[PDB]
């Protein structure tokens, strides 16, 4: 009786929650697209699906590539770690705004 | 005899730190009120409250990891510039004489305020209160420039007599051990 | 070299508090404006009363 | 750097602007209300003393 | 799988950006398939108030992946006789979760874009806390079925003393 009314329950909701969590996904893009771009708004972002094996060159060449459109003469290679206060960094940093999805 | 010795040596001993302390705070604020203005230093014409502002001293070697810090955590927009201060100066609660750096950072409201003053009492900074218009500035610099010179004489003084009490009570303690 | 960019902020300041200021002005001015159009609305149906008043006498 | 300086004096010009524009348009569309309102209350109140009165 | 979102920050137009991160970027070689993560234009709020947005979407983020991946988990432990082919059970819609997400699209008709970030991301913690209480609720509800069917399994089970 009960079995047949969860699946369906729950089929129709995890595209809901999902939607939510790519919607928290975008508007996360956009907030820190705009701090580390300041107005007016130029984002157009890409979704990247790497391919095997493929990160390591192709991060190398994504980072040579944005050297100069995001400044490298800040961070990337190395930081402390910023404990003490209301916030620390749980994100590696690259010369450009990236976020990820976990299908 | 041996009480009010005792007594007279513990009490300036212990005034004498406070003493220190004070006066290497004010001389730390007279040096941050002083290249303020020179960082003013662009065209006076104004005859003299959204942009929040605050300023500080720093060690050396520090600068680069602060500064990037501080760049990543409020990510291009946390306007902080910085100078030398020359000769060393001695850090009142650390000990040390070590050369400094005066620092200040701007920023636009209250999330980046706490961010920023956060992140300087992490890196154990030293802040003291600074103005925000030239008659302000003027204030603080007579206070401190009063008060430093002021605190500086006791602080001589009573050192002084910490000197004659010390050499009054070496003159006759082994008699007195002796008795 | 430095000093420009306190300065711009500064002014930029500034400019920014002065519009707000002028922002604020526009609220009171625009208020007793408001009060003063409701008073003569006031005054309108204080007439028109007057005359039906009037009639009924 | 010079680079650095100057990006990030723009985006901070920028959003001062943005947040004077935001009070701004804030405080016109509160005036707004306010006179709407205000009118309604003095109106109102006033009327309904010379309701009494007539 | 895994997707990536990458800024594309403008470039003093769009085109200058884009063509170059995705053609010019395959054709060098094919170490990733490329596409458009279609943002909306939302308004802009003052910087400090993007400033608090940033802790608020930061925590938020790491709070929806776990409920998100709990509605699965939960999913897949009711449909446990038959979770083969997971991905499906799951999606949202489409064909496949990657057909889905390569075409994703700000949707107004669930939220609309005038209101502000706050707003709009409050009314999605709503949503997503209130998935969180139903599945505790009904989940556990199945999931008392189930240990009450084990229950009956237990009175079935063992020597004549325990049965």
């Given at each position: ?78 930081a402390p770690m910023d404990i003490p206060g209301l916030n620390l960094s749980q994100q590696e940093y690259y010369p450009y705004v990236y976020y990820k999805i976990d299908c | 005899n041996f009480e009010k010795i005792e007594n ?172 | ?57 | ?54 | ?37 279609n943002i909306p234009d939302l308004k802009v709020g003052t910087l400090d108030v993007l400033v608090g947005l940033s802790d608020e979407l930061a925590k938020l983020d790491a709070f929806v992946e776990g409920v998100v991946k709990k509605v699965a988990q939960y999913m897949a432990d009711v449909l446990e006789d038959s979770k083969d082919k997971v991905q499906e059970n799951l999606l949202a819609s489409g064909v496949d979760l990657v057909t889905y ?63």
């Amino acid at each position: 009786k009960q079995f047949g009314p969860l699946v369906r329950w729950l089929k129709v909701n995890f595209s809901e929650a999902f939607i939510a969590w790519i919607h928290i996904k975008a508007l996360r893009v956009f907030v820190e697209s705009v701090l580390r771009y300041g107005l007016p708004v130029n984002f157009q972002a890409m979704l990247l699906q790497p391919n095997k094996k493929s990160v390591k060159k192709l991060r190398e060449v994504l980072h040579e590539l944005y050297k100069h459109l995001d400044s490298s003469a800040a961070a990337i290679i190395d930081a402390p770690m910023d404990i003490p206060g209301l916030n620390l960094s749980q994100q590696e940093y690259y010369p450009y705004v990236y976020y990820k999805i976990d299908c | 005899n041996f009480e009010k010795i005792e007594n007279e040596l513990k009490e300036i001993n212990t005034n004498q730190e406070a003493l220190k302390r004070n006066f290497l705070e004010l001389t730390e604020l007279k040096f941050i009120l002083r290249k303020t203005q020179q960082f003013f230093d662009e065209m006076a014409d104004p005859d003299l409250l959204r942009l929040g502002f605050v300023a500080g001293v720093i060690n050396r070697e520090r600068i680069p990891t602060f500064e990037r810090m501080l760049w990543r955590v409020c990510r291009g927009n946390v306007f902080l510039r910085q100078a030398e201060i020359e000769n060393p100066l001695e850090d009142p609660v650390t000990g040390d004489y070590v050369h400094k750096s005066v620092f200040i950072i701007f920023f636009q409201g209250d999330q980046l305020k706490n961010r920023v003053k956060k992140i300087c009492e992490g890196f154990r900074a030293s802040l003291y209160p600074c103005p925000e218009t030239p008659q302000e500035r003027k204030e603080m610099a007579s206070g401190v420039n009063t008060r430093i010179d002021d605190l500086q004489m006791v602080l001589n003084q009573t050192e002084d007599h910490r000197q004659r009490v010390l050499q009054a009570a070496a003159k006759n303690i082994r008699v007195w051990f002796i008795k | 070299s430095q000093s420009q960019g306190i300065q711009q902020l500064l002014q930029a300041e500034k400019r920014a508090a002065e519009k707000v200021a002028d922002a604020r002005k526009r609220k009171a001015r625009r208020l007793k404006q408001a009060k003063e159009e409701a008073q003569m609305e006031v005054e309108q149906y204080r007439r028109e009363r007057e005359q039906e008043f009037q009639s009924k006498q | 750097s010079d680079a650095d300086v100057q990006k990030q004096i723009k985006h901070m010009m920028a959003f001062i602007e943005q947040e004077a524009n935001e009070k701004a348009e804030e405080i016109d569309a509160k005036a707004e209300e306010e006179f709407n309102i205000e009118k309604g209350r003095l109106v109102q109140t006033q009327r309904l003393k010379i309701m009494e009165y007539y | 799988t895994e997707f990536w979102l990458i800024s594309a920050p403008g470039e003093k137009t769009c085109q200058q950006t884009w063509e170059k991160l995705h053609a010019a970027t395959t054709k060098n070689n094919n170490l990733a398939v490329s596409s458009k993560f279609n943002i909306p234009d939302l308004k802009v709020g003052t910087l400090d108030v993007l400033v608090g947005l940033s802790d608020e979407l930061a925590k938020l983020d790491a709070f929806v992946e776990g409920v998100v991946k709990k509605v699965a988990q939960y999913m897949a432990d009711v449909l446990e006789d038959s979770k083969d082919k997971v991905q499906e059970n799951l999606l949202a819609s489409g064909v496949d979760l990657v057909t889905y997400i390569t075409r994703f699209q700000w949707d107004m008709a669930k939220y609309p874009i005038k209101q502000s970030l706050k707003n709009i991301s409050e009314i999605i913690a709503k949503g997503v806390t209130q998935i969180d209480n139903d599945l505790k609720s009904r989940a556990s509800a199945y999931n008392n079925l189930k240990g009450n069917l084990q229950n009956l399994e237990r009175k079935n089970a063992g020597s004549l003393l325990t049965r």
